[PDB]
Write a protein that binds this ligand. Sequence first.
Ligand SMILES: O=P(O)(O)O[C@H]1[C@H](OP(=O)(O)O)[C@@H](OP(=O)(O)O)[C@H](OP(=O)(O)O)[C@@H](OP(=O)(O)O)[C@@H]1OP(=O)(O)O
Ligand SMILES: O=P(O)(O)O[C@H]1[C@H](OP(=O)(O)O)[C@@H](OP(=O)(O)O)[C@H](OP(=O)(O)O)[C@@H](OP(=O)(O)O)[C@@H]1OP(=O)(O)O
Lengths: 341, 337, 94, 103, 35
Amino acid sequence: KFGKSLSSQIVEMQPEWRDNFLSYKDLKKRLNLTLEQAGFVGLLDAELDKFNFFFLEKEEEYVIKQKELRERKMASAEEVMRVRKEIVDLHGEMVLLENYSALNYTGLVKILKKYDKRTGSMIRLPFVQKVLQQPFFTTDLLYKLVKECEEMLDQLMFTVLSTKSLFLGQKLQVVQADIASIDSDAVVHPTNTDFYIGGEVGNTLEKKGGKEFVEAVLELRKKNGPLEVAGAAVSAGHGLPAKFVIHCNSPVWGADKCEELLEKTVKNCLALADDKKLKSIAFPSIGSGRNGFPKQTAAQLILKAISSYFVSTMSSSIKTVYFVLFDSESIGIYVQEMAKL
Amino acid sequence: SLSSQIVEMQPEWRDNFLSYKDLKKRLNLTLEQAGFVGLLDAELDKFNFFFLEKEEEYVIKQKELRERKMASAEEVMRVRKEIVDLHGEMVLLENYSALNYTGLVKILKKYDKRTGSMIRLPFVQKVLQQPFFTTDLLYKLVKECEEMLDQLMFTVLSTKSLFLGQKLQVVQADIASIDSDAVVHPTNTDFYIGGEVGNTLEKKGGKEFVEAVLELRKKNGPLEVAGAAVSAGHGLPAKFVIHCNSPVWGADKCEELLEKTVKNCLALADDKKLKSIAFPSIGSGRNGFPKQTAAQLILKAISSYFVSTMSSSIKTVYFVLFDSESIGIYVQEMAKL
Amino acid sequence: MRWTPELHERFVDAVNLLGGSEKATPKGVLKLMKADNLTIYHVKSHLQKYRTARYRPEGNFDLTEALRLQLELQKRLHEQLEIQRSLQLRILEH
Amino acid sequence: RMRWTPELHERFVDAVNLLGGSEKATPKGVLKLMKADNLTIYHVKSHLQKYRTARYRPELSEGNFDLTEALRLQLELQKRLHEQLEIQRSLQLRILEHHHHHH
Amino acid sequence: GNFDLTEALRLQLELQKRLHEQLEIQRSLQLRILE
Ligand SMILES: O=P(O)(O)O[C@H]1[C@H](OP(=O)(O)O)[C@@H](OP(=O)(O)O)[C@H](OP(=O)(O)O)[C@@H](OP(=O)(O)O)[C@@H]1OP(=O)(O)O
Ligand SMILES: O=P(O)(O)O[C@H]1[C@H](OP(=O)(O)O)[C@@H](OP(=O)(O)O)[C@H](OP(=O)(O)O)[C@@H](OP(=O)(O)O)[C@@H]1OP(=O)(O)O
């Protein structure tokens, strides 16, 4: 299917970039096929020459652009340094003017006292009252200007175990709590084809939820019948703080393409969560334990599937993904593999 | 005083303060009252004129600096955007070359299959000699671009903030390669360096680390149980290495001894005014301590130490762990902190 | 004479309206600012200062930290001057 | 010859600066200043063309959080693709070496 | 026969890498078109 993926990547590119990958009409010519085979190899050489020319042109352009942008980066850093230096200097000068005003006031009070003592009069108080009205004393504007300079310089210069802010814009939290009580929009329940409720997840959901929860599970099984492997279905979270419950049939370790089936299970759960326009989903320990998956393998596969799903679905409404874990080794493995996404 | 204050100032500030010449005038002296008051009013007018001139100048300068700063910010954003776009175009060219090479390989395989020939290998050898699909220089350009972008703007696994602002961080790295000020080395009474931490520390430090350990053993002698001693981090990114003798599980009051071990390591870190310290898995494993028990006791010791030591200079405490179960246990027990 | 950032903003706008920043006339700027009883002399001196000021002739983190320390010292000095002012006024109250 | 590299481009820009502004530099003088082997006036001159065109900046004479996050997302995607392409490079080299030494 | 098994594993890795790179270049062109 290499040709299909190649063409799907081409169609979304700029006209310059298209018609410079090798055409996949060479399969037709190949079919029509040592002299004419030598002509076919000459066609291959023509494709090589096309690649050479295009690549060399783009490479020269990129070299020039990178030297230019490095020069501009150095210039910009120098300019930012100069600007902040000048602003700090202006701040200091304003403070120095304040000190000038205060020091002159002090000396003036001193000389007024000396005058009142020399003559025996009492003019210091009214003279200072008049001095207070002088603009060299009204330093309110200096306070405002210093505050402005300082603001410019400031702008220029349920237990959660582990968090990971994904580069795509979502939050991956390994938490520890009763999954039935966690206020998540969706809660994933791994089950079998016949929708068993014997799971630990199923047990706590049956304890928290009422008879209406079991009735909703039964009605979901009535509507969809058997649940195929890697498939998933959605029921309403009746009697639960969760809005919806997403049941899934996780594959068994050792089956044909069981890892791809686990990835598909995770992706189907996420797709169903987006089908209900939900913003959060809670995943228990899936794959490991009952289904025989080793812990590290299942963790890395699930995290891979989540990341690739969110890569291929930019319109997704899911903002937070919870991982409800109790096994200490599983917690450590999930933290390790989650920090590497 | 006043003159000594005005010495270290620019010329326009000099001869603009209160001239003390009026003292002589005061010594010469209501007619002179009017004369003196007029001189004082002249000084006040001088003050006002100078102050208003400086204020106008400062307003002008602030306007100019604000506009200049906004211009520089626009230029920063433009340069950042353009470098990201160039990085993207270069990655697209790499993908171009890779896709074309893969298509060529597929076509060569199909040709060798249909025609019954064997030219895929020499044709690919020829392809290797072409100007495209020689992306060492392009890779270096992309790497330098990522460097510049990092400037323009070891893995931490979990972080817990204490009440007094200290950071407990479980990280995944080599404990010898961390740049923490102090690195704790669990050992015995004879400063044995054959432990796990011992071997990695020795790999990094070498002869200098071994000499530091030997000199510390000679200066300190036997390392008592729950004791600790500092050595210089010669040949190590760390500044110092705190060797400790963790107690053995099942010994008399081994819990209190482990608590005292951790607190003595922290006290030695504070004696040298260190800002960060790295802890490996202490007590658990070699000394028979179960993992969760040791992790909890160590975390309690750290917490109560920071409670009882208000003048502690330690800001960050690293936990370098390799076992996944140990990492999970420490994460869970920090959640309980 | 008492210039303020708001009046200076209005002044810069009026200068931008009256041709270029260098090819400007204080009388025209005054005609564009018929408020606060501004004079030709004061506006002319302010334009002279503005024209003379707008001319721009044509481990680093250690220096940046030294600059941060300078700013911090200046801020502390400003706060000390503020408490000085309040203290001196309270003395004048006796 | 026509393979312009960062070092050769640096030498070219240095020669241009020796002659003055790129707008007033002469390709013949640049060729005289560059002792690079097998360097023709055609290559020097076409490259001076591309350089002068790239150096022009017309933008000089004329929410931020969402924009910065979109830019950071783009950059992160590009970085991921680059490292994936490096891994693919390694795999291709291994497969080709094994097919060369084992047929 | 371990050599042939290694070669098959490397080919599988190559296909997986191709699919992932396709997804990523798709997302990048998407982000460009949306902005
Ligand atoms: O692009 P490919 O990787 O070569 O995939 C297939 C190839 O199957 P493979 O996945 O095993 O290589 C088909 O051959 P089969 O093994 O299924 O018989 C082949 O031919 P058919 O589907 O007609 O049998 C088909 O087309 P082509 O004849 O052009 O090589 C081609 O896929 P593409 O159409 O994308 O090349
Ligand atoms: O101006 P100061 O740096 O503060 O020091 C004093 C001043 O002290 P006070 O103003 O704080 O009281 C004297 O003031 P009086 O005695 O008039 O109150 C003053 O006058 P005297 O000469 O009568 O002591 C003397 O003046 P001078 O510099 O001429 O000595 C002067 O300076 P000194 O520190 O040298 O004493």
